[PDB]
Design an enzyme around this catalytic site. Structure first.
Site, PDB file in Angstrom:
ATOM      1  N   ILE A   1      -4.666   1.291  -1.543  1.00 51.91           N
ATOM      2  CA  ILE A   1      -5.014   1.722  -0.087  1.00 51.91           C
ATOM      3  C   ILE A   1      -4.796   3.086  -0.184  1.00 51.91           C
ATOM      4  CG2 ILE A   1      -4.230  -0.368   1.044  1.00 51.91           C
ATOM      5  CD1 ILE A   1      -1.677   1.260   1.654  1.00 51.91           C
TER       6      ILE A   1
ATOM      7  N   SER B   1      -6.142   7.270   0.021  1.00 52.62           N
ATOM      8  CA  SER B   1      -6.104   8.403  -1.030  1.00 52.62           C
ATOM      9  C   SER B   1      -5.206   8.051  -2.094  1.00 52.62           C
ATOM     10  CB  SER B   1      -6.139   9.508  -0.774  1.00 52.62           C
ATOM     11  OG  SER B   1      -4.785  10.218  -0.486  1.00 52.62           O
ATOM     12  N   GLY B   2      -5.461   8.194  -3.484  1.00 54.68           N
ATOM     13  CA  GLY B   2      -4.221   8.078  -4.574  1.00 54.68           C
ATOM     14  C   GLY B   2      -3.772   9.524  -5.194  1.00 54.68           C
TER      15      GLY B   2
ATOM     16  N   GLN C   1      -1.736  11.675  -4.685  1.00 49.13           N
ATOM     17  CA  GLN C   1      -0.453  12.121  -4.894  1.00 49.13           C
ATOM     18  C   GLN C   1       0.515  11.068  -5.329  1.00 49.13           C
ATOM     19  OE1 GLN C   1       1.620  13.692  -6.241  1.00 49.13           O
ATOM     20  NE2 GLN C   1       1.780  15.710  -5.064  1.00 49.13           N
ATOM     21  N   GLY C   2      -0.139  10.073  -6.157  1.00 44.99           N
ATOM     22  CA  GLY C   2       0.542   8.944  -6.799  1.00 44.99           C
ATOM     23  C   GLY C   2      -0.275   7.753  -5.863  1.00 44.99           C
ATOM     24  N   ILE C   3      -0.539   6.566  -6.531  1.00 45.08           N
ATOM     25  CA  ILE C   3      -1.074   5.408  -6.253  1.00 45.08           C
ATOM     26  C   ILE C   3      -0.234   4.684  -5.220  1.00 45.08           C
ATOM     27  CG2 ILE C   3      -2.174   3.086  -6.792  1.00 45.08           C
ATOM     28  CD1 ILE C   3      -2.287   5.025  -9.868  1.00 45.08           C
ATOM     29  N   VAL C   4      -0.785   4.239  -4.134  1.00 50.16           N
ATOM     30  CA  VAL C   4      -0.277   3.384  -3.188  1.00 50.16           C
ATOM     31  C   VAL C   4      -0.763   1.931  -3.052  1.00 50.16           C
ATOM     32  CG1 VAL C   4       0.787   3.526  -0.626  1.00 50.16           C
ATOM     33  CG2 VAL C   4       0.148   5.901  -1.852  1.00 50.16           C
TER      34      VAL C   4
ATOM     35  N   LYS D   1       4.383   3.116  -3.208  1.00 44.11           N
ATOM     36  CA  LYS D   1       3.885   3.929  -3.796  1.00 44.11           C
ATOM     37  C   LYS D   1       4.626   4.136  -5.410  1.00 44.11           C
ATOM     38  CE  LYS D   1       3.562   8.872  -3.671  1.00 44.11           C
ATOM     39  NZ  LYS D   1       3.394  10.359  -3.102  1.00 44.11           N
TER      40      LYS D   1
ATOM     41  N   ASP E   1       1.902  21.736   3.347  1.00 44.75           N
ATOM     42  CA  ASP E   1       0.861  20.909   2.627  1.00 44.75           C
ATOM     43  C   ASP E   1       0.158  19.774   3.516  1.00 44.75           C
ATOM     44  OD1 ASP E   1      -1.082  20.564   0.511  1.00 44.75           O
ATOM     45  OD2 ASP E   1       0.301  18.858  -0.183  1.00 44.75           O
TER      46      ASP E   1
HETATM   47  C1  LIG Z   1      -2.008  -5.634   3.670  1.00 40.85           C
HETATM   48  C2  LIG Z   1      -2.931  -6.791   3.459  1.00 40.85           C
HETATM   49  C3  LIG Z   1      -2.101  -7.748   2.951  1.00 40.85           C
HETATM   50  C4  LIG Z   1      -3.826  -6.779   2.421  1.00 40.85           C
HETATM   51  N1  LIG Z   1      -3.503  -7.240   4.776  1.00 40.85           N
HETATM   52  S1  LIG Z   1      -2.982  -6.300   6.196  1.00 40.85           S
HETATM   53  O1  LIG Z   1      -3.933  -6.922   7.417  1.00 40.85           O
HETATM   54  O2  LIG Z   1      -1.272  -6.661   6.259  1.00 40.85           O
HETATM   55  C5  LIG Z   1      -3.321  -4.525   5.791  1.00 40.85           C
HETATM   56  C6  LIG Z   1      -4.186  -4.238   4.678  1.00 40.85           C
HETATM   57  C7  LIG Z   1      -4.671  -2.824   4.378  1.00 40.85           C
HETATM   58  C8  LIG Z   1      -3.888  -1.864   5.229  1.00 40.85           C
HETATM   59  C9  LIG Z   1      -4.439  -0.145   4.892  1.00 40.85           C
HETATM   60  C10 LIG Z   1      -5.574   0.245   4.686  1.00 40.85           C
HETATM   61  N2  LIG Z   1      -5.987   1.598   4.221  1.00 40.85           N
HETATM   62  C11 LIG Z   1      -5.118   2.526   4.384  1.00 40.85           C
HETATM   63  C12 LIG Z   1      -5.318   4.372   4.077  1.00 40.85           C
HETATM   64  C13 LIG Z   1      -4.212   5.287   4.339  1.00 40.85           C
HETATM   65  C14 LIG Z   1      -2.686   4.752   4.578  1.00 40.85           C
HETATM   66  C15 LIG Z   1      -2.479   3.589   4.877  1.00 40.85           C
HETATM   67  N3  LIG Z   1      -1.129   2.989   5.081  1.00 40.85           N
HETATM   68  C16 LIG Z   1      -0.195   3.665   4.496  1.00 40.85           C
HETATM   69  C17 LIG Z   1      -0.262   4.377   3.102  1.00 40.85           C
HETATM   70  C18 LIG Z   1       1.063   5.037   2.536  1.00 40.85           C
HETATM   71  C19 LIG Z   1       2.360   4.457   2.899  1.00 40.85           C
HETATM   72  C20 LIG Z   1       2.556   3.865   4.115  1.00 40.85           C
HETATM   73  N4  LIG Z   1       1.331   3.228   4.926  1.00 40.85           N
HETATM   74  C21 LIG Z   1      -3.417   2.246   4.655  1.00 40.85           C
HETATM   75  C22 LIG Z   1      -3.185   1.015   4.930  1.00 40.85           C
HETATM   76  C23 LIG Z   1      -3.004  -2.160   6.286  1.00 40.85           C
HETATM   77  C24 LIG Z   1      -2.584  -3.566   6.617  1.00 40.85           C
END
Ligand SMILES: CC(C)(C)NS(=O)(=O)c1ccc(-c2cnc3cccc(Nc4ccccn4)c3c2)cc1
Length: 328
Positions: A25, A27-28, A30-33, A48, A144
């Site tokens: 999910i 951008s990666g 700063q580490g893959i999330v 992460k 940043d």
């Molecule tokens: C998660 C699964 C099981 C696949 N289904 S979902 O409806 O719970 C769901 C799927 C994807 C996201 C999602 C998609 N793009 C993102 C882009 C940047 C940041 C996010 N959220 C995030 C990023 C880093 C740390 C904590 N939260 C994203 C979440 C959220 C809920």
């Protein structure tokens, strides 16, 4: 053990069996999330993988800061740590750190794409300022902040993802290598707000030097008193450049970018421009504070032991991080 591996992007995540359906999910950079299901909590979480925490001093400091501050900071506008782990059993073998966080719905990149509303925008910025204020009270200055390390739920609650420095959103003083203070982060918030209005990055330098031209083309050349704070080589370059008048903030952010045709709208148009004009100030000495931006009419509708000094060797960083990993 209780670990398995899955391939994610170009790397391999090795994670506890409890975390299932790992999905890349955001951008990666700063580490893959990943998004994952936590079967023990029975909730979705974000995991992460820190990127080469022991590649060097910089990576290790950064890994230590991120992990420590994420354990120790607790605030509604700052991402929550749920868990920390490593697949490795001993210090010798230790190479990888995983942070498990609450899962949000998107980063600010995606929210900037959508049309602009005043109520949403001031709410997003309010929460940004609350988070930043809370960081500052703890002695943490970020430096940043950018849309992709800010995350949001569909309900528009916002959390700051990371803790910044141990580029488009960087304050003039940071870029120009001069001192920095708290209001360094005000500059980044102005960039993000302006971009919510333009739907275009305000300052797209196609290099670190052209960046600066873009800033003063739009904002104007700062006063000689600003330029006197620059080191010799930087001052030289800066002051002996064609003087720019810049554009006024009504020109920089025209009526067409905002909702129009109601007293409320035209008011919020001016309050947003006014705020923009006090955040996007090159000279940090003239730029609004966090306390003040929170008291601003556009925003106020919403009112209701760890080493940062020293260098260390990679092995001492390894031990410092490892014990931080092992003690919750
Ligand atoms: C998660 C699964 C099981 C696949 N289904 S979902 O409806 O719970 C769901 C799927 C994807 C996201 C999602 C998609 N793009 C993102 C882009 C940047 C940041 C996010 N959220 C995030 C990023 C880093 C740390 C904590 N939260 C994203 C979440 C959220 C809920």
């Amino acid at each position: 053990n209780q670990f398995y591996s899955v391939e994610v992007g170009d790397s391999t995540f090795t994670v506890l069996k409890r975390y299932q359906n790992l999905k890349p999910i955001g951008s990666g950079a700063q580490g893959i999330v990943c998004a994952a299901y936590d079967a023990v909590l029975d909730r979705n979480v974000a995991i992460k993988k820190l990127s080469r925490p022991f590649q060097n001093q910089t990576h290790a400091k950064r890994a230590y800061r991120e992990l420590v501050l994420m354990k120790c900071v607790n605030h509604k506008n700052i991402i929550s740590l749920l868990n920390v782990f490593t697949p490795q059993k001993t210090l010798e073998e230790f190479q990888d750190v995983y942070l498990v966080m609450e899962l949000m719905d998107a980063n600010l990149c995606q929210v900037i794409q959508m049309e602009l509303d005043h109520e949403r925008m001031s709410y997003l910025l309010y929460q940004m300022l609350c988070g930043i204020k809370h960081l500052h009270s703890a002695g943490i200055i970020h430096r940043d902040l950018k849309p992709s390390n800010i995350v949001v739920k569909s309900d528009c609650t916002l959390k700051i993802l990371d803790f910044g420095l141990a580029r488009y959103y960087r304050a003039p003083e940071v870029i120009l290598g001069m001192g920095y203070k708290e209001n360094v982060d005000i500059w980044s918030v102005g960039c993000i707000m302006g971009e919510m209005v333009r739907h275009k990055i305000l300052f797209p330098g196609r290099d670190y030097i052209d960046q600066w031209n873009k800033v003063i083309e739009q904002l104007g050349t700062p006063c000689p008193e600003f330029m006197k704070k620059l080191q010799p080589t930087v001052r030289n370059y800066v002051e002996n450049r064609p003087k720019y008048a810049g554009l006024t903030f009504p020109k920089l952010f025209p009526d067409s970018l905002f909702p129009a045709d109601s007293e409320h709208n035209k008011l919020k148009a001016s309050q947003a421009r006014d705020l923009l004009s006090k955040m996007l100030v090159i000279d940090p000495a003239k730029r609004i504070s966090v306390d003040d931006a929170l008291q601003h009419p556009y925003i106020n509708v919403w009112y209701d032991k760890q080493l940062d000094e020293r260098e260390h060797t990679i092995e001492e960083w390894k031990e410092l991080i490892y014990k931080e990993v092992m003690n919750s």
